[PDB]
C-alpha cells in the first residue's frame, strides 16, 4: 500500500508555510512554569517532516489525480518556501521528486493529458514553475518527433526558468538536507534534462563537482536498466568516463585505466598550492575512497609526504598551504577529506587486509600527523560553522584512535612496538579529549 | 596615533559618500569608518531600531561571545530565504570579530574605497591588539596587496616585514621612486 | 461648503462638535445650539474629507481627521492655538475611518482605509503615532467602530462585505479574529456597535444593498442573530447609524430621509418609538 | 589594583571598600524547552522581508517573520524573569539562545564590563583575551532606551529595565509580594550610584550616553516605607519583617518593637 497519501501531501506542505500561531481565544494568562504552551509548537514542525518521506519515492507510486495537480496558481504564491530552514524546504523537494525515473513513465499525472492542459492554461507566473513540469513534457515532445510535434510552450517554460529565481538554489539545498538521505536522491536521476535542452548552465561547474566523489546505489539509480530516453543515460555511457553533458549529470581496474592511475594523480595535486577553480579539489581527492579501502600498496609512497595530509615535511596538515590560500570550499571540505582518510587508516590496522602494506605502517602514516599540539590543532579550519548539523565530524575521527588499540584488539598484537609513537600524541590528553568538548561550548549549544 | 593616521587619510573618500545618497546602514558603516560610534547609534535609533543600536554600541569593542552569535546569524541567513542587504551583512562582519577572515571577504570597498579603508577594519574590529600590530598588518598584506608603488604603502610593508626587512627593501626601492 | 456634509460628530461632553464636508478642510463648529461657532478652519487636506472624531476625554480632546489624500492629521490645542502634533500617513488610498478608543480603555485611535488596512495607532510617549498594520477586509476596510464595555475590542465593515469582530490578546499581541458575519451582498457603509449600559449589543451593520441588517446579541454571550430593520429592500440607500448611550435607540437617516427611532420591542419587532 | 585600570577593577574596588552595597547586591541576586532554530524563509514569500535580522521586526510590525517565535519572545522571557532573581545573567544567556534569538542574545554579552590583559592586571590572568564592552556606560544608557521603548511590548523589555537597573515595569514581578518589589528597588539603588562612582573614576562622559544619567543617590530605608505601605499583606508575616531588618541592618530596633 503506498497509494493513499493523495491528500496527506497537500495538507502537510500547507501547514508549515504561513500557518503557525493561530488562536480564536483571547486574554490568555501568564506565568506558572512561565507553562509548556510554547513547547508543543516545536513538535508540530518535527512532525511535518515525518509524513513526507513517501513523496521522496513517489515515482514508485501511481497516478496522482487531475484535481490537486491542477492547483499551482493559487498554490503557487508562497514560492514553496524557498533547523526551520530544512523543515520548510521539504515542499520544494517533495513536489519535484514526484517525477524520478526507473522507466515507468508512458502517456505518449504522467498518464494523463487533462493534467497538463488544465494546469497550462493558468501559467507564465521560475525554476519551480519548470522543475518536474517541463520534464514530463520533454518526454511528451520526445515521443512526438515522428508525430505533429509541439515545442512552443515547452521552450517558453525553458526560457522563463532562466528569469528571477535560479535553478541552482535547488540542487545545493537538496544536499543540505540529510535528515534521512531520501532527500538527496532527488538529484542524480533528474539532472539529465537540466543540461539536455535548457541552455547550458555554467554554474553546474560548482554544484555537480560535489556529487562525483562516491555513489554506490543511491545517486546511480537512474540508468543501467533505463532506455526510456534516447538522450543522457548509459546510451552515451559505454565509452570512457573521462559528450560534455557526460560529467555534468552522470558518474586491475587501477592499471586498466592508465603503472597505475594511482601513480598519475601523485603530482597533480603537488601543483596546487595557490590554485583556484576549487571544483577539481572537491571531486578528485574526495574520489579517494573508491580504491582507499584495502589498499595502500602504492599510495603509501606519496602519502609519506603528500600534499593531501602531512606534517613531517610540510607545514600544518599540508592544507594550511591550501587552507590559507582560500576561505572557500576546498579548505573546509578538504579538511573533512583529511578526517575521512584518517579513520580509513585506523580502520585497517584493527585488522590485516591483503595485497597491501604492513600494519605498522598504517599507524606511522598517522604518526607523521602527530604534529598538532603546537598550534596545528588550532589552525585546522577558519571561521566557525555554528549551525547544528555539521563541524562535529572534525574530531570524531581523532577520538577513537585510543579505543582502537587500548581497548580494541581484533588481531591476535594490535600494540607491539607501536606504543612508542602512539603515545607521542594518543597517550597524551588532546587525543584523549581534554580540548575537544571545549571547542564546542558555543559551536555545540545542544545537548546541554 | 596609528589609527588616527589610518582614519585621517580616508577622510575625503568617506566624507564624499556621506554627502551622497546612501543606505541608512551604509551611513552607520561610513560613520564607523571615521570612527564615530554614538552618532552611528543615534542614526540606528532613528530607524526605530533599538536592538540594532545596542549592537553599534558594542563597537569600539569586540568580545568573544558576540562573534559566535554573529557567525551563527550570517549562516542562518544562507540556509534561510532570499533577499538580504549587504551593508547589514557588513555590520555583522564587524561583530564576527572578523572583517575579512569570516565567511565573506570585502572586495566591494577596494573598488569604491582604498586598501587603507581595509586596514582600518582590521585594527579596529579585527581584534583590538590582542594580537601584535606587526602580525595584524602582515596578515593584511597577504590578504590585500598593498602597493609597491605608493610610498606610504611601503611603510606598511616594511612594518609587516619588520622580521627580515632587507630583502623586501631592495626590491621595492626599485619600485618606489616617489 | 457645508452642503454635502459627510460627518458631524460630537465629543462625550456634547459641548464640542466637528463637521467635515467636500470642503477639503475641517470647519470646527462647536455646539452652542443650532448656532455653532467657528474657532479655526483647519486646512491641511487635499480632497474630500470623510470622518473626523474628537478624542474620548481622558487624553485630551484631540481631533483626528481622515481624508482622500492619505492623511490623518492629529490636531491639538496647545496653549490656545492649534498645531498638527503628529501626521499618520501610512496610506495612499482614501482613509475612511477615524474613531478613538472610549476612556474606559486607553489611548488607541482606530484608523481604517480602503487600501486594505486597519491601523491601531499606538500613542508613544510624546504623542508620537506608531501603528501596527492589520487587515480585515482585503478589498478595503470602509469603517471601524469600537466596541466599549456594555480585553480591547472593535468591529470593521467590509468592502468584501463581511463584518469582522476583532478581539485583543496579549500572548499573540494583536487583534484575534473573533468571528465573521455576512448577511450582506453589497458593500458595508458603517458598522455601529451599541453603547448600551447593560449586557446587550445590537449592531446596525449598515449596507449599500438598500438594506440594514441588525445583528443582535440579546445579551453579549447570546450569539449574533440575523434580523432586519425591515424585511424589504428600501427605496433608497441608507446612511449613518448611531446608538444611544442609554436606551439603545437606533437612529439613521435614509436617502428619502427615513427617520429611524425603531427599537426592538418585546415581540422582537423593530417598533416605532419616541 | 591601583595604578591604571579599565572599568573592571573599578567595580571590584567598589565592592571591596564598602560592604553594605556588597550585601545589597547579594540580596537581590538570591531568591527546559526544545527549540530547533531558524527564520527568514516564510517571511519573504508572503510579502516583503528584504533583509534578514530581527531588526526588521523593529522597523515595523512584529508579525513579519514567523509568529511561533513571536510566541517565544513572551514565554521564554517569562522564564528569564524567574532566573534573574535566582541570580546571574549568563544563565539567562543560555535560555535566550533557545529562544530562537541569536543577535538579541548579544545584549546579554553586553552586560559584561571590560576584562582584559591590556587594561587589568589581576583580571589579566583568569582571562588571556578581551571580554566585555569598554563603552559599557553608553551600552547601559542605550539598553535603558529599550526599557521605555513603546514598540517593545512588556514581555521583552522588563529584563532591559533590569540591565540598567530596574524600573518596576510589572513583568519583573512574578511573585508580586514585598520581596519581589524590594529586589528591583535595590537593583536601581546600586545602578544609579555606580555611575556616580564611575564619574570619580571617569567612565562616564558626554559620549557615554544617548540619555542623560540619573546621578541621584537613592536611599534604602525610604524605599522600604514605599514597600511597607504597598504590602500590608506581608506586614501580617512578622518573618518577612525580620527579613527587611537585616538589609536595613537595624536588629535592636525590630527586637525592641516585638517586646
- In sequence order, what DSSP letters do the residues of C180-226 get, joined into one string? -----SS-EEEEEE---SSS-EEEEEEESSS-EEEEEESSTTS--EE
Instruction: Suggest the residue from C153, C165, C169, C175 to mutate for an interface test with chain A (most A CBs closer than 10 A).
Output: C169
Chain A residues with CB under 8 Å of a chain B CB are 81-83, 85-86, 169, 173, 176, 324, 327, 382-387, 442-443
CATH code, domain carrying C141: 2.130.10.10
Sorted by sequence, the CB contacts under 8 Å of residue A415 that are 6+ apart come out as A405, A406, A422
DSSP assignments along A263-283, one per residue: HHHTHHHHS-SS---GGGTTT
Asked whether C251 and C261 are in contact (CB, 8 A), the reply is yes
Q: Do A23 and C167 touch (CB under 8 A)?
A: no
Helix (H, G, I), strand (E, B) or coil at C101: coil
CB contact under 8 A, C177 and A24: yes
CB-nearest partner of B75 from A81, A327, A386: A386
List chain C residues with CB under 8 Å of D72: none
A217 — contact with chain D (CB < 8 Å)?
A: no
Return all residues near D233 (Cβ < 8 A) that are at least 6 apart. Answer: D177, D178
Nearest CB neighbour to B81, from listed D41, D131, D207: D41
Query: Which chains lie within 8 Å of chain C at 3 or more CB pairs, if any?
Result: A, D
- The alpha carbon torsion through D212, D218, D222, D225 (nearest 10 deg) reads 60
- The most distant pair of C-alpha atoms in chain D lies apart, rounded to whole Å, by 73
Q: Virtual CA dihedral for A83, A327, D110, D97, nearest 10 degrees?
A: 10
Search chain C and give the residue with CA nearest A24: C178
Q: What are phi and psi of A95, to 5 degrees?
A: -70, -20
C168 contact D CB<8A: no
Instruction: Give the C-alpha separation, C184 to C207, whole Å.
Output: 7
Measured over the CA atoms of residue C3, residue C7, residue C10 and residue C11, the dihedral's sign is negative
Which of the 8 DSSP states describes residue A425?
A: T
Contact A21 C178 (CB under 8 A): no
Which residues is C153 bridged to in the sheet? C167
User: Which residues does chain B have within 8 Å of residue D149's beta carbon, measured at their own beta carbons?
Assistant: 50
Chain B residues close to A381, C-beta within 8 Å: none
Q: Could you tell me if A26 lies within 8 Å of chain C, comparing CB atoms?
A: yes
Pairwise CA distance, residues D159 & D175, whole Å: 16
Q: Locate cell 525590630: which residue?
A: D254
Please answer whether residues C63 and C54 qualify as being in contact, where contact means their C-beta atoms are separated by less than 8 angstroms: yes
Instruction: Answer left, alpha or beta for residue A277, where phi above 0 means left and psi between -120 and 50 means alpha.
Output: left
With CB atoms and an 8 Å threshold, state whether D42 touches B47. Answer: no
Identify all chain C residues contacting A37, using CB atoms and an 8 Å cutoff: 171
Taking CB atoms and an 8 Å limit, are A84 and D72 in contact across chains?
no
Eight-class DSSP state of D186: H
Task: Identify the closest residue of chain A to D45 by CA–CA distance.
Answer: A78
Q: Which residues, including other chains, have CB under 8 Å from residue C181's CB and lie 6 or more apart?
A: C162, C163, C164, C165, C205, C215, C224
Residue with cell 481631533: C63
CA distance C250 to C264: 9
Length of chain D: 259
D134 touches B: beta carbon within 8 Å: yes
Resolution in A: 11.6
Inter-residue contact B63 to D128 (CB < 8 Å): no
Helix, coil or strand: residue A160: helix
3-state secondary structure of C133: strand
Q: 3-state secondary structure string, chain B?
A: CHHHHHHHHCHHHHHHHHHCCCCHHHHHHHHHHCCCCHHHHHHHHHCCCCHHHHHHCCCCCCCHHHHHHHHHHHHHHHCCCCCCCHHHHHHHHHHCCCCCCCCCCCCCCCCCCCCHHHHHHHHHHCCCCCCCHHHHHHHHHHHCCCCCCCHHHHHHHHHHCCCCHHHHHHHHCCCCCC
Please check whether residue D39 touches A, CB under 8 A. Answer: yes
Domain count, chain C: 1
Whether the Cβ atoms of residue C243 and residue C261 lie closer than 8 Å to each other:
no
Contact between residue C85 and residue C78 where contact means Cβ atoms under 8 Å apart = yes
**Closest to B33 in 3D by CA, of B14, B20, B18:** B14
Contacts D33 to A, Cβ<8 Å:
38-39, 42
Cell of residue B61, nine digits: 569593542
Question: Which residues of A are less than 8 Å from C167 in CB distance?
Answer: 26
Give the CA distances from residue C198 to residues A27, A237, C149, in Å, rounded to whole numbers and listed in that order.
22, 85, 9
- Beta strands across the sheet bearing C175-179: C141-146, C153-158, C163-168, C175-179
CA D158 to chain CA centroid, nearest Å = 9
Separation between Cα atoms, residue A415 and residue C202, nearest integer Å? 91
Mutate which of C171, C172, C175 to test chain A, going by most A C-beta atoms within 10 A?
A: C171
Experimental determination approach used: cryo-EM
Q: Are strands C131-135 and C141-146 parallel, antiparallel or unpaired?
A: unpaired
Grid look-up 567598589 returns D14
Residues of D in contact with A78 (CB under 8 A): 42, 45-46
DSSP H or E segment with residue D195: helix D178-200
**Does residue A24 sit at the C interface (CB-CB below 8 Å)?**
yes
Q: Which of A81, A85, A382 sits opposite B79 (nearest CB)?
A: A85
Does the beta carbon of A30 lie under 8 angstroms from any beta carbon of chain C? yes
Who among D40, D130, D151 is closest to B130 (CB)?
D130
Instruction: Determine the Cα–Cα distance for residues A282 and A207; give it in Å rounded to an integer.
Output: 10
Q: Could you say which of A21, A24, A28 has the minimum Cβ distance to residue C178?
A: A24
Give me the domain span that covers residue C165: 3-274
CB-CB contact of C101 with C53 (8 Å): no
* Contact call for B54 and D107, based on CB within 8 A: yes
C-alpha cell recorded at residue B84: 538580504
Q: How far apart are the first and last CA of chain B?
A: 24
Instruction: Find out whether A285 and A308 touch, Cβ atoms under 8 Å.
Output: yes
Measure in Å the smallest separation between the Cα of A27 and chain C Cα atoms: 5
Question: Are the beta carbons of D55 and B49 separated by less than 8 Å?
Answer: yes
D35 touches chain B (CB under 8 A): no
C-alpha cell at A151: 515545442
Residue D46 half-sphere exposure toward CB, CA atoms < 13 A = 11
Q: How does DSSP classify residue A163?
A: S
Size of interface C-D (CB pairs under 8 A): 23
Q: How far apart are the first and last CA of chain A?
A: 42
| Alpha carbons C56 and C65: distance in angstroms, whole number | 14
| Side-chain-facing half-sphere of A224: CA atoms under 13 Å | 8
Closest listed residue to residue B41, CA positions, set D138, D214, D160, D131: D138
Q: Which three cell numbers stand for residue C217?
A: 446579541
The C-alpha cell at A436 is 575537544
Residue C113, classed as helix, strand or coil, is: strand
Amino acid at each position: 500500500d503506498r497509494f493513499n497519501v493523495v491528500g496527506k501531501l497537500i495538507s502537510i506542505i500547507s501547514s508549515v508555510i504561513q500557518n503557525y500561531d493561530i488562536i480564536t481565544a483571547s486574554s490568555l494568562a501568564h506565568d506558572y512554569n512561565n507553562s509548556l504552551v510554547q513547547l508543543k509548537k516545536f513538535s508540530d514542525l518535527k512532525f511535518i517532516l515525518q509524513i513526507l518521506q513517501i513523496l521522496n519515492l513517489m515515482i514508485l507510486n501511481t497516478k496522482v489525480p487531475v484535481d490537486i495537480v491542477n492547483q499551482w496558481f493559487l498554490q503557487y504564491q508562497n514560492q514553496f518556501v524557498e533547523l526551520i530552514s530544512r523543515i520548510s524546504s521539504l515542499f520544494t523537494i517533495t513536489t519535484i521528486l514526484i517525477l524520478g525515473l526507473n522507466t515507468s513513465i508512458a502517456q505518449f499525472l504522467y498518464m494523463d493529458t487533462e493534467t497538463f492542459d488544465t494546469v497550462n492554461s493558468a501559467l507564465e507566473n521560475h525554476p519551480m514553475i519548470h522543475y518536474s513540469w517541463s520534464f514530463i513534457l520533454y518526454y511528451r515532445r520526445a515521443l512526438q518527433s515522428s508525430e505533429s510535434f509541439d515545442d512552443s510552450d515547452i521552450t517558453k517554460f525553458a526560457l522563463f526558468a532562466e528569469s528571477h529565481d535560479v535553478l541552482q538554489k535547488l540542487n545545493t539545498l537538496s544536499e543540505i538536507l540529510s535528515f534521512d538521505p531520501v532527500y538527496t536522491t532527488v538529484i542524480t536521476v533528474f539532472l539529465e534534462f537540466s543540461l539536455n535542452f535548457i541552455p547550458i548552465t555554467a554554474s553546474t561547474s560548482r554544484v555537480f563537482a560535489k556529487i562525483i566523489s562516491k555513489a554506490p546505489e543511491q545517486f546511480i539509480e537512474n540508468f543501467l536498466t533505463n532506455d526510456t530516453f534516447e538522450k543522457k543515460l548509459s546510451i552515451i555511457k559505454a565509452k570512457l568516463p573521462l559528450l560534455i553533458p557526460l560529467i555534468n549529470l552522470a558518474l586491475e581496474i587501477l592499471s586498466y585505466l592508465s603503472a597505475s592511475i594511482i601513480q598519475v594523480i601523485f603530482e597533480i595535486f603537488e601543483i596546487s598550492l595557490q590554485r583556484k577553480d576549487y571544483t577539481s579539489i572537491v571531486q578528485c581527492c574526495e574520489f579517494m575512497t573508491m580504491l582507499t579501502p584495502n589498499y595502500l600498496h602504492l599510495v603509501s609512497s606519496y602519502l609519506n609526504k603528500s600534499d593531501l595530509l602531512d606534517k613531517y615535511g610540510k607545514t600544518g596538515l599540508s592544507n594550511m598551504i591550501l587552507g590559507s590560500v582560500e576561505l572557500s570550499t576546498g579548505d573546509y571540505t578538504f579538511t573533512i577529506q583529511l578526517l575521512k582518510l584518517t579513520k580509513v587508516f585506523i580502520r585497517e590496522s584493527l585488522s590485516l587486509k591483503n595485497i597491501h602494506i604492513s600494519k605498522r605502517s598504517k599507524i606511522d602514516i598517522i604518526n607523521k600527523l602527530i604534529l598538532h599540539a603546537i598550534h596545528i590543532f588550532e589552525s585546522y579550519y577558519n571561521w566557525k560553522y555554528n549551525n547544528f548539523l555539521q563541524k562535529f565530524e572534525i574530531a570524531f575521527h581523532l577520538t577513537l584512535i585510543f579505543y582502537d588499540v587500548l581497548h580494541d584488539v581484533f588481531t591476535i598484537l594490535i600494540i607491539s612496538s607501536s606504543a612508542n609513537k602512539l603515545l607521542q600524541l594518543f597517550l597524551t590528553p588532546m587525543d584523549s579529549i581534554d580540548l575537544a568538548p571545549n571547542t564546542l561550548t558555543n559551536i555545540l549549544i545542544s545537548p546541554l | 596615533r596609528l589609527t588616527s593616521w589610518i582614519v585621517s587619510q580616508i577622510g575625503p573618500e568617506i566624507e564624499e559618500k556621506i554627502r551622497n545618497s546612501s543606505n541608512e546602514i551604509e551611513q552607520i558603516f561610513l560613520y564607523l569608518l571615521l570612527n564615530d560610534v554614538v552618532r552611528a547609534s543615534k542614526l540606528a535609533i532613528e530607524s526605530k531600531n533599538g536592538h540594532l543600536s545596542v549592537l553599534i554600541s558594542y563597537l569600539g569593542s569586540n568580545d568573544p561571545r558576540i562573534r559566535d552569535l554573529a557567525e551563527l546569524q550570517l549562516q542562518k541567513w544562507s540556509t534561510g530565504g532570499c533577499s538580504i542587504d549587504k551593508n547589514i551583512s557588513k555590520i555583522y562582519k564587524l561583530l564576527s570579530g572578523s572583517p575579512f577572515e569570516g565567511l565573506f571577504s570585502l572586495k566591494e570597498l577596494e573598488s569604491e574605497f582604498s586598501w587603507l579603508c581595509l586596514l582600518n577594519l582590521t585594527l579596529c574590529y579585527g581584534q583590538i591588539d590582542e594580537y601584535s600590530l606587526e602580525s595584524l598588518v602582515q596578515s593584511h598584506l597577504d590578504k590585500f596587496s598593498l602597493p609597491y608603488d605608493d610610498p606610504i604603502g611601503v611603510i606598511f610593508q616594511l612594518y609587516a616585514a619588520n622580521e627580515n626587512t632587507e630583502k623586501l627593501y631592495k626590491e621595492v626601492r626599485q619600485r618606489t621612486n616617489a | 461648503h457645508n452642503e454635502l456634509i459627510h460627518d458631524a460628530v460630537l465629543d462625550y461632553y456634547g459641548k464640542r462638535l466637528a463637521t467635515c464636508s467636500s470642503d477639503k478642510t475641517i470647519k470646527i463648529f462647536e455646539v452652542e445650539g443650532e448656532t455653532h461657532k467657528l474657532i479655526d478652519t483647519l486646512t491641511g487636506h487635499e480632497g474630500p474629507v470623510w470622518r473626523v472624531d474628537w478624542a474620548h476625554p481622558k487624553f485630551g480632546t484631540i481631533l483626528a481627521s481622515c481624508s482622500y489624500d492619505g492623511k490623518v492629521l492629529i490636531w491639538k490645542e496647545e496653549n490656545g492655538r492649534w498645531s498638527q502634533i503628529a501626521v499618520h500617513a501610512v496610506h495612499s488610498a482614501s482613509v475612511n475611518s477615524v474613531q478613538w478608543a472610549p476612556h474606559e480603555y486607553g489611548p488607541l485611535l482606530l484608523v481604517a482605509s480602503s487600501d486594505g488596512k486597519v491601523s491601531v495607532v499606538e500613542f508613544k510617549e510624546n504623542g508620537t503615532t506608531s501603528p501596527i498594520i492589520i487587515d480585515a477586509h482585503a478589498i478595503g476596510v470602509n469603517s471601524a467602530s469600537w466596541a466599549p464595555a456594555t480585553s480591547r475590542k472593535f468591529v470593521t465593515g467590509g468592502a468584501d462585505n463581511l463584518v469582522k469582530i476583532w478581539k485583543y490578546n496579549s500572548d499573540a499581541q494583536t487583534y484575534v479574529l473573533e468571528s465573521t458575519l455576512e448577511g450582506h451582498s453589497d458593500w458595508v457603509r458603517d458598522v455601529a456597535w451599541s453603547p448600551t449600559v447593560l449586557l446587550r449589543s445590537y449592531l446596525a451593520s449598515v449596507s449599500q444593498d438598500r438594506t440594514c441588517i441588525i445583528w443582535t446579541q440579546d445579551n453579549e454571550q447570546g450569539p449574533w442573530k440575523k434580523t432586519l430593520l425591515k424585511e424589504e429592500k428600501f427605496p433608497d440607500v441608507l446612511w449613518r447609524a448611531s446608538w444611544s448611550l442609554s436606551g439603545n435607540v437606533l437612529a439613521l437617516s435614509g436617502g428619502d430621509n427615513k427617520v429611524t427611532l425603531w427599537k426592538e420591542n418585546l415581540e422582537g419587532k423593530w417598533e416605532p418609538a419616541g | 589594583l591601583h595604578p591604571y585600570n579599565s572599568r573592571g577593577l573599578f567595580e571590584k574596588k567598589l565592592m571591596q571598600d564598602n560592604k553594605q552595597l556588597y550585601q545589597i547586591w547579594i540580596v537581590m541576586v538570591w531568591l527546559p524547552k526544545n527549540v530547533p532554530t531558524s527564520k527568514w524563509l516564510n517571511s519573504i514569500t508572503s510579502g516583503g522581508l528584504k533583509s534578514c535580522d530581527l531588526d526588521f521586526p523593529l522597523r515595523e510590525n512584529t508579525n513579519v517573520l514567523d509568529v511561533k517565535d513571536k510566541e517565544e519572545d513572551h514565554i521564554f522571557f517569562k522564564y528569564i524573569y524567574e532566573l534573574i532573581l535566582a541570580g546571574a545573567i549568563d544563565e539567562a544567556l543560555e535560555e535566550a539562545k533557545l529562544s530562537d534569538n541569536i543577535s538579541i542574545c548579544m545584549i546579554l554579552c553586553g552586560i559584561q564590563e571590560y576584562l582584559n590583559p591590556v587594561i587589568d592586571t589581576q583580571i589579566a590572568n583568569e582571562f588571556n583575551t578581551q571580554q566585555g564592552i569598554k563603552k559599557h556606560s553608553l551600552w547601559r544608557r542605550t539598553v535603558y532606551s529599550l526599557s521605555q521603548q513603546a514598540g517593545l511590548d512588556p514581555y521583552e523589555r522588563a529584563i532591559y529595565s533590569y540591565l540598567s537597573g530596574a524600573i518596576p515595569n510589572q513583568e519583573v514581578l512574578q511573585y508580586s509580594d514585598w520581596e519581589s518589589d524590594l529586589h528591583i528597588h535595590l537593583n536601581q539603588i546600586l545602578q544609579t550610584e555606580i555611575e556616580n562612582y564611575l564619574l570619580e573614576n571617569n567612565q562616564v562622559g558626554t559620549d557615554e550616553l544617548i540619555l542623560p544619567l540619573p546621578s541621584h543617590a537613592l536611599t534604602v530605608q525610604e524605599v522600604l516605607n514605599r514597600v511597607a505601605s504597598r504590602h500590608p499583606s506581608e506586614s501580617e508575616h512578622p518573618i518577612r519583617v525580620l527579613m527587611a531588618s537585616v538589609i536595613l541592618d537595624s536588629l535592636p530596633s525590630v527586637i525592641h518593637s516585638s517586646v
